[PDB]
Amino acid sequence: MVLSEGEWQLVLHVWAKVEADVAGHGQDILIRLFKSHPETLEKFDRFKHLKTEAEMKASEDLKKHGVTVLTALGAILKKKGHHEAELKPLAQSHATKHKIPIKYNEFISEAIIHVLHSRHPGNFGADAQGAMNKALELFRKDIAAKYKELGYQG
Ligand code: HEM
C-alpha cells in the first residue's frame, strides 16, 4: 500500500504533538496495551511482575521503555514509507529474540489510536485517524513480511 502526501501530513501533524511529551505518551500507550491485553505483559520479563496500573505508572523503567518504543516508531513514520532499513533490526529482534506474535502488533496499534484520540481530539478527527491507521497497517504488513523472510511468520 501507499499513503498519499496528504495522509502523511495528517500523521506527522499529530505526531508533532506527541513529541511535545514522548515519555507521557509512551507510558499511556503501554499501560493501555497491558490493561486491554494482559497477555502482552507476559512477554516482558522486565515488567511481568507489575500487578496494578498504579505500579505501572510508578515504574521508571516502563516509562523509559515507552520513550524507546515511541522514538523508534517516530523514526519510521518520518520516513513516509521508505522505512526498509529501520524495519530490519526491529523485525529481527521481535521475531527471534523476543518472540512476539504478529497479532500483538495490532494490539499496540489499537492502544496508540486510543491514546491519540483521547489526548488530541482536535488533531485526531476521522480523517487523521484514518491516515494513522493506514500508516500503522503499512507498518504491520511490512513487519509481517519480514517475519516470514526471517523464518517466523505469525
Ligand atoms: C510499534 C511496535 C513496536 C516498536 C516500535 C517496538 C520497538 C522496540 C524497541 C526499539 C525495543 C528495543 C530494542 C530491540 O530489542 O529491538 C523493543 C524491545 C522489546 N519489545 Fe518492542 N516494539 C514494538 C512492539 C512490541 C510489542 C507489540 C511487544 C510485546 C507485546 C514488544 C515486545 C518487546 C520486548 C519484550 C522487548 C524487550 C524489552 C527489554 O528490554 O526487556 N514490542 N521494542
Curated annotation (Swiss-Prot):
InterPro entries for the chain? Globin (IPR000971), Globin-like_sf (IPR009050), Myoglobin (IPR002335)
Which keywords has UniProt assigned to this entry? Cytoplasm, Heme, Iron, Metal-binding, Muscle protein, Oxidoreductase, Oxygen transport, Phosphoprotein, Transport
Q: Which residues bind nitrite?
A: H65
Q: Which E.C. number(s) belong to this protein?
A: 1.7.-.-, 1.11.1.-
The answer to whether UniProt assigns keyword DNA-binding to this entry is: no
GO:BP terms for this protein? removal of superoxide radicals
The cross-references to Gene3D superfamilies, in alphabetical order and at most eight, read: 6.10.140.2100, 6.10.140.2110
Keyword Metal-binding listed? The answer is: yes
Residues where O2 binds:
H65
Q: Which residues carry this modification: Phosphothreonine?
A: T68
- Ranges for domain Globin: 2-148
> GO terms for molecular function, please?
heme binding; metal ion binding; nitrite reductase activity; oxygen binding; oxygen carrier activity; peroxidase activity
A GO CC annotation recorded here is: sarcoplasm
PTM Phosphoserine: list the residues: S4
Task: Name the major location.
Answer: cytoplasm
| Pfam families in the cross-refs | Globin
Reactions catalysed = Fe(III)-heme b-[protein] + nitric oxide + H2O = Fe(II)-heme b-[protein] + nitrite + 2 H(+); H2O2 + AH2 = A + 2 H2O
Instruction: Give residues annotated as binding heme b.
Output: H94
- Report the function annotation for this chain: Monomeric heme protein which primary function is to store oxygen and facilitate its diffusion within muscle tissues. Reversibly binds oxygen through a pentacoordinated heme iron and enables its timely and efficient release as needed during periods of heightened demand. Depending on the oxidative conditions of tissues and cells, and in addition to its ability to bind oxygen, it also has a nitrite reductase activity whereby it regulates the production of bioactive nitric oxide.
Kindly state the subunit structure of this protein: Monomeric.
Q: Which family does it belong to?
A: Belongs to the globin family.
The protein's name is Myoglobin
Q: Which gene encodes it?
A: MB
